[PDB]
Ligand binder design. Structure first.
Ligand SMILES: CC(C)CCC[C@@H](C)[C@H]1CC[C@H]2[C@@H]3CC=C4C[C@@H](O)CC[C@]4(C)[C@H]3CC[C@]12C
Ligand SMILES: CC(C)CCC[C@@H](C)[C@H]1CC[C@H]2[C@@H]3CC=C4C[C@@H](O)CC[C@]4(C)[C@H]3CC[C@]12C
Ligand SMILES: COc1ccccc1OCCNCCCOc1ccc2c(c1)NC(=O)CO2
Lengths: 222, 286, 337, 57
């Protein structure tokens, strides 16, 4: 109608097209939520690949944005729903922490704190159908520490011999038994160390598997 | 007439009304609810539109033909009816093919799914489907270079082979191949997953449940299409070649024709009534 | 230590007794003989579309037609509510926004979130574009709410259990408000901008003097986190909305709670609260996708606004009192009369 | 020395909150009712207005 009204309408249309273009660009992104109890190797994982840290990387033409909220030391349930709708949760746990108590002792193990955090995030109402890539870092240091000291310090009800393979298998079993949504989500467990160069490949494989299984569910085949 | 045309008309009208209602409900749900607006549902809704066009244009004239045992609408209307029947049925079958192909790409190429899959792809698939329908329906209008009481498609051998293979047999082969590859991919993904013994047994039970579910799904998908359209195209292929050797009973021919036509009624149930998103959308809108 | 704890206990008991002494009559008894508001029925006059992710905050401008909305698609969008036109679309450096504010002069907007930064954008430039004017970084937790006092002062609440008054020109914290033990989730300036109330996850509300930076009063009647807070237009009372499925009204001078707005069939949390122009109506957004209009004097459900398919995250009444805006997780804004 | 300092800070904050003067709840409720009655007419959401005066139709 009026010249100013027409200019406003054209401005709004241009803004609309820019917004839809930005949405199209951002839809071609795989969003990952990075978590872990303390510093259990998150930084190592990020190197291998304010208040929230964003790491963007493209692997095999697939773009990933990973959001780390470790420095956010507040009430998690006040913002955890902000990450509803991520493709996957990358949860990092240090295998060497089975004997270390904590930053402040508080007679609670670092491994038990990690297990509690994993249980809470895995069975969170916002992530009923979100998959978890479970990185178990520091396997070399864990092997040394299990050579020197028993695993019974962390898990008193342990019967296997003090060797890396079955100790790590028992730890993985303990972590994966915390999943109550066994018919809705899967846990992709990987033992990592500092020198490993296949972590990004493992994440890519887990993400492609998640995408394919979601498509199968949509087609009624899963 | 007194005891036969009434029940025949009642049954045919009930079928036509149910088909129209189902397809219209699917289209309305997709056009209303934003949770049903993606490429797959766009293909499904395009299939619903094609089946609705069937049930609105072709099915009434076919039902009148069935009840009166005679074509009363004239030669021009007979030609238009044949063209619409061919176009709409071909478009429906190739819509099934397009849905299968999109599912195959989504299951076998997650990278393409994330990066290069857009509603433009659904638009191109629908356009190609309708183009194939036009290509199958045009030769009768162009001449491909009688009985006034009956409306019958051309019985030329060349056009018979052309129409039957370009409308049902090549699509059937494509559907079989695509869903076989999809079945292999699904079986691989299901089997790749497989106290410790209790967890292992639970995982095995879940894998068996998923295998049975995918077998049931593909069985329903392929069996509906086959048991609806295969007898019709078998008859339409073998009958024109043995003109005098084999005769087709009228009752069996009518059963076969309407069995083929029931696919436009069963496709909504298969594609947008068994789907969880569609069920939730219906519950919300109701 | 222990003696100090006992003295603190005695002080708490003394405050409770002094507040119980003032409770002579109930607000329900005082308002029992007034005409009920009736059935309040509003209709969606406008629908604003263009956000592609959840909406977390909106704020009306002082002209009552321009509003700002913030969404996790990393977008700060300024809407003309009359024509539904979009005037600005600000690309956020961090997409994890949880609050936005409109300056009273209309020359600036602010936002913030999980980046712990309060970003101030200038809307009045020579070439007519929007550029980041300032970034306020001192907070060590997520920014939950912010409100301008003028073009150069802004008050923020943070998940680090702290509020802060910022001078925008220098970027420093002019004042820091401490005393909450949980994350501060909401913030409401008094009409004269001399005081402000804040609600936190400690199930407590606190009144702060802007000039002196001290907690005047503490109000504790909620049994869960306080998610929203709003000032009555008098400036002598305020309303708090918590996730115990209850809104509450507190009076500054009476120094206690007057009314509790709750229903048996309402069990979800309250995300946002606001008052009508006269303060007779209290509008509250809920997790169950609906907004409820309460009679603020009789505590009765006057009306329901049901037009969102996801959680109503925010709401705001215009300054002239003509319209109410709701913003939901379903990425749509709605203007109701 | 942090625990005793925090306890003393809480004690002085409690004293500052306690040494205030409060009015009656009946008086506060009467003031709220008076405000709502004095501004009841110019409240469009409480008092629906004709569409000719409605910017949102
Ligand atoms: C014309 C239409 C209605 C025909 C539909 C036929 C459907 C219902 C039939 C055809 C083939 C059938 C499947 C054949 C084999 C099996 C494997 C068995 O372990 C479970 C049942 C299951 C999975 C059947 C389910 C039902 C099934 C899919
Ligand atoms: C879901 C349902 C409705 C789909 C399948 C319906 C089937 C059973 C219906 C649809 C149309 C029907 C046909 C319509 C007309 C005639 C002609 C009559 O002289 C004999 C029966 C016969 C040949 C009917 C047989 C049954 C039939 C094929
Ligand atoms: C040969 O096919 C096709 C060829 C190419 C594409 C699609 C094709 O598929 C057509 C499906 N539709 C055929 C039947 C229409 O013709 C009749 C319908 C009902 C009738 C009769 C004929 N005759 C009766 O006696 C009474 O009922």
């Amino acid at each position: 109608l009026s010249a100013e009204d027409k200019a406003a309408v054209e401005r709004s249309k241009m803004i609309d097209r820019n917004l839809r273009e930005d949405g199209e660009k951002a839809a071609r992104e795989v969003k990952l939520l990075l978590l872990g109890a303390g510093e259990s190797g998150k930084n190592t994982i990020v190197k291998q690949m304010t208040g929230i840290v964003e790491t963007h990387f493209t692997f095999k033409d697939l773009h990933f944005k990973m959001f780390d909220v470790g420095a956010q030391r507040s009430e998690r349930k006040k913002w955890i729903h902000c990450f509803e709708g991520v493709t996957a949760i990358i949860f990092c746990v240090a295998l060497s922490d089975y004997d270390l108590v904590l930053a402040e002792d508080e007679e609670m193990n670092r491994m038990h704190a990690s297990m509690k955090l994993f249980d809470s995030i895995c069975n969170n109402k916002w992530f009923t159908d979100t998959s978890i890539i479970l990185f178990l870092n520091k396997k070399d240091l864990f092997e040394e520490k299990i050579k020197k000291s028993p695993l019974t310090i962390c898990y008193p009800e342990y019967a296997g011999s003090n060797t890396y393979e079955e100790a790590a298998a028992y730890i993985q079993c303990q972590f994966e038994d915390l999943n109550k949504r066994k018919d809705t989500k899967e846990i992709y467990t990987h033992f990592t160390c500092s020198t490993d160069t296949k972590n990004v490949q493992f994440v890519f494989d887990a993400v492609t598997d998640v995408i394919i299984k979601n498509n199968l569910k949509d087609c009624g085949l899963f | 007439t007194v005891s036969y045309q009434v029940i025949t008309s009642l049954l045919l009208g009930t079928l036509i009304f149910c088909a129209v209602l189902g397809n219209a409900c699917v289209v309305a749900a997709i056009a209303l609810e934003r949770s049903l607006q993606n490429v797959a549902n766009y293909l499904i809704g395009s299939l619903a539109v094609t089946d609705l066009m069937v049930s609105v244009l072709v099915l009434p004239m076919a039902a009148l033909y069935q009840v009166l045992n005679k074509w009363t609408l004239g030669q021009v209307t007979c030609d238009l009816f044949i063209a619409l029947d061919v176009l709409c049925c071909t478009s429906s079958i190739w819509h099934l093919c397009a849905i299968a192909l999109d599912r195959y790409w989504a299951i076998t190429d997650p990278i393409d799914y994330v990066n290069k899959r857009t509603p433009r792809r659904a638009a191109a698939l629908i356009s190609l489907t309708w183009l194939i329908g036009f290509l199958i329906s045009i030769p009768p209008m162009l001449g491909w270079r009688s009985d006034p009481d009956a409306c019958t498609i051309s019985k030329d051998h060349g056009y018979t082979i052309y129409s039957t293979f370009g409308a049902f047999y090549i699509p059937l082969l494509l559907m079989l191949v695509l869903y076989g590859r999809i079945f292999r991919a699904a079986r691989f993904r299901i089997r790749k997953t497989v106290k410790n013994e209790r967890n292992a047994e639970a995982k095995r039970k879940m894998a068996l449940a998923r295998e049975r579910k995918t077998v049931k799904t593909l069985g329903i998908i392929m069996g509906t299409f086959i048991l609806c359209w295969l007898p019709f195209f078998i008859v339409a292929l073998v009958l024109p070649f043995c003109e005098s050797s084999c005769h087709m009973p009228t009752l069996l021919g009518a059963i076969i024709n309407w069995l083929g036509y029931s696919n436009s009624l069963l496709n909504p149930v298969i594609y947008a009534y068994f789907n969880k998103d569609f069920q939730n959308a219906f519950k919300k809108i109701i | 230590l222990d003696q100090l704890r006992q003295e603190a206990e005695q002080l708490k008991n003394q405050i409770r007794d002094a507040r119980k002494a003032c409770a002579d009559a109930t607000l329900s008894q005082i308002t029992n003989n007034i005409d009920p508001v009736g059935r309040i029925q509003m209709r969606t006059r406008r629908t604003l579309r263009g956000h592609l992710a959840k909406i977390y905050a909106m704020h009306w401008g002082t002209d009552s037609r321009l509003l700002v909305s913030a969404s996790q698609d990393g977008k700060l969008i300024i809407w003309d509510s009359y024509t539904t036109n979009k005037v600005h679309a600000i690309p956020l450096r961090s997409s994890w926004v949880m609050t936005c504010a409109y300056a009273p002069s209309g020359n600036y907007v602010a936002c913030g979130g999980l980046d712990n930064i309060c970003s101030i954008y200038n809307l009045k430039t020579r070439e007519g574009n929007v550029r980041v004017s300032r970034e306020l970084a001192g907070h060590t937790g997520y920014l939950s709410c912010c409100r301008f006092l003028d073009d150069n002062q802004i008050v923020t609440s943070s998940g680090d259990t702290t509020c802060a008054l910022w001078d925008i020109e220098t970027g420093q914290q002019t004042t820091t408000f401490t005393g909450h033990t949980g994350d501060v989730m909401s913030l409401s300036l008094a009409p004269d901008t001399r005081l402000f109330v804040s609600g936190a996850c400690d199930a407590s509300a606190k009144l702060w003097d802007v000039r002196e930076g001290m907690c005047r009063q503490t109000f504790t009647g909620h049994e869960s986190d306080i998610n929203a807070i709003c000032f009555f237009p008098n400036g002598n009372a305020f309303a708090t909305g918590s996730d115990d499925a209850t809104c509450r009204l507190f009076d500054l001078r009476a120094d206690q709670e007057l009314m509790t707005y709750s229903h048996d069939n309402i069990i979800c949390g309250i995300t946002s609260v606001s008052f009508s122009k006269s303060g007779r109506l209290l509008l509250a957004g809920y997790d169950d996708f609906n907004c409820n209009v309460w009679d603020a004097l009789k505590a009765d459900r006057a009306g329901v606004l049901a037009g969102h398919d996801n959680r109503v995250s925010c709401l705001g009444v215009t300054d002239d009192g003509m319209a109410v805006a709701t913003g939901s997780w379903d990425s749509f804004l709605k203007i109701w009369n | 020395t942090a625990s005793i300092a925090q306890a003393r800070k809480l004690v002085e904050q409690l004293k500052m909150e306690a040494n205030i003067d409060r009015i009656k709840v009946s008086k506060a409720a009467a003031d709220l009712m008076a405000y709502c009655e004095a501004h009841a007419k110019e409240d469009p959401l409480l008092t629906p207005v004709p569409a000719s005066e409605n910017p949102f139709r």
